[model samples]
Target: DFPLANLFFVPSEDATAFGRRLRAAAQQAPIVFDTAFGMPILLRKSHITTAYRDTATFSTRMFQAGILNGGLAAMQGDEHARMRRVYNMFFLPRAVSQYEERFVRPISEQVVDRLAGKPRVDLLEDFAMELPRRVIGELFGFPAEKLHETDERVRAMLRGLVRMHDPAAVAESQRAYGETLGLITEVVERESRDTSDTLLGEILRTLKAEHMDTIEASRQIVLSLILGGYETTSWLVANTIHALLAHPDTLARVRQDPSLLPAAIEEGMRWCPSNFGVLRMVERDVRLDDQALSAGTVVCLAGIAGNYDETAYPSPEVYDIDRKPLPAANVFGGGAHFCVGAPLARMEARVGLQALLARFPGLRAVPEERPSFMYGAKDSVAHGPDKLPVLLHH
Candidate 1:
């Protein structure tokens, strides 16, 4: 029953091996409780998505210690619903699409433009990571001059949330969280003076009509957006590039027909997701795939594991851009807790990839400095390459 608990901690030398391990575990059972974490992991796409949808039974809880307590992500039932309603309108596809021409395209071009004519570059550092913070910060109406500092604070905040067990990390995380919260408070008040079209402005205008802690609402909203968008979207671009460079034929096809870039991005999400899985606590007794899960049991809805489920994605291991429609891909999650910034995440990846392909048609990985992925054999919630060294024109 627990044969696959080790699978969760196994060191996956590369992205392919990570999937292979998860796929092998899927064959073991639809659900397996990892002894190390002492929680059940839903491996199959059907079971994982079912858990995501049935939030009443499987409630979202980052940690019992309350890393982001009162934030939208950690809330459940009516409270979560109320906050989601306020935030959802600003992140819808139509609202996000408006940023494509204004923010997404030019920023993508400018970010990729920096890499031109360079002999080598760390794509993760030079390209993937820069775009998301810049895009999301701009969306919040944060001053351009302050973004780099804000990005550092956001990184610190996320690390603290994940590594709360460490005393030093906890202290620094509190400082960073306070600094970021102060910045958001200032921005919210200033924007309220003459409301603009920024996300914070729109949310403030809506909150003014309703009775709630606007400052608390602003803090949680901005924190959630930054926390959710920055690193996750960064790895989506990084992992997709890694997948493409690993398969030069697929890379070549995308270069030849740029139209395939979107599908390639989608495949990349399935093939190399940023999140290993999200943490949830079971709220009620439930039977998933005929396996009984009791109340108060911890569960990990492993999206990364489900991506390699051959039942859901035929030839799941193969990197195919032309793969059939994958509507069931829980890359953005599902139900009430679906990622609010899904559209923005997709646009950033698509536009960023299109720009990269256009600028460097012959991009190739630096074999001497092999691409490195983070959180291998560790209990971190997110996973992706720390460094993706590459030759700009190889």
Candidate 2:
């Protein structure tokens, strides 16, 4: 009668294949119920957009999972607004632009220089994953040598958070979660005492004025940014490159006119987004179209499905770089919960892609019988490759 009961929870071999099933479910009805998750997934752009905007009923408490407690993404109502007001100024495009030359380009250029002579490289390992880790680390004023020490634990915790059904995954996440808290706590204490300045320093100071639990607030904020920016941006860069190579015509068009790179990035976001959609818990009984949703019902505002909504995006299946800017491009979400790191993510993607192209004009993905992918759990979150094999000088 409906789609897979565990559609959101079951892993797929590829996001492209998973996306097709998601879009097919959307075509079946405006709202589809997920029996496994016991909730309704909103498929239409109007419904999805409304839910995103309607923070009154669609609470983001569902985002308060594990280490994300009281972070910006999970906050609602006044506290959420207050925190956004404090943090919003720092994440604007103009503010983020200051870091591009200092943090983004230098790191990208360094990675490109190393990859220039290599015959074959895993872009995810060699370039994509490394870029954001270093950039965010430097921006937060972490010691360069010690920056990557947190990687294994961070990755483990993130994997566990998304794949919670497994007891082993949950246990690992708990251990990592406690360890990460201790790690961040040390940094918070150290940074607070030091006169040295960094983004974390400024954020800590500002949050102190508003939050009673300044150290805890600062720790959670750092964790949130790392979780938000690191892998998501990595996958964005990798997925965009993958999308371009997969469609040679589109890749050629971007190569011919580099101005189209931004559009290509947006298309990559729409075509192969990192996550299927955002999850929210229904707070009050509400009616959307003909269906009635009860309090405590969880709903997934499936923006990924809306991106493929043919009425808004003509020839939805076709990956068109020159396609017009769309309202349905809700990948970063909208309203209050819109990602603060949006500007930074875009800047990193642009610089990262430009660095790759400028270094290797003949760059292309290596053909494989079965490409390796990561974060493919049934949750359908964090979609991208474990490794993207590519020829540096094809």
**Best prediction by lDDT:** 1
Off by over 4 Å in 2: 1-15, 35-39, 143-152, 159-172, 209-213, 369-380
Pairs in clash, predicted candidate 2: 9-378, 10-378, 11-378
Name the runs in model 1 displaced over 4 angstroms: 1-4, 7-10, 35-38, 61-65, 143-147, 150-156, 159-176, 195-197, 287-292, 374-381
| Ten contiguous residues minimizing lDDT sum, candidate 2 | 372-381
What TM value does model 1 have? 0.87
Please list all clashing residue pairs in model 1, or write none if there are none: none
Model 1's number of clashes is 0
Best by TM-score: 2
Q: Give the TM-score of candidate 2.
A: 0.89
TM-score of each: 0.87, 0.89
Model 1 over residues 57-123: C-alpha lDDT tens digits?
8887645444477678888889888878877887777877888888999989988888887899988
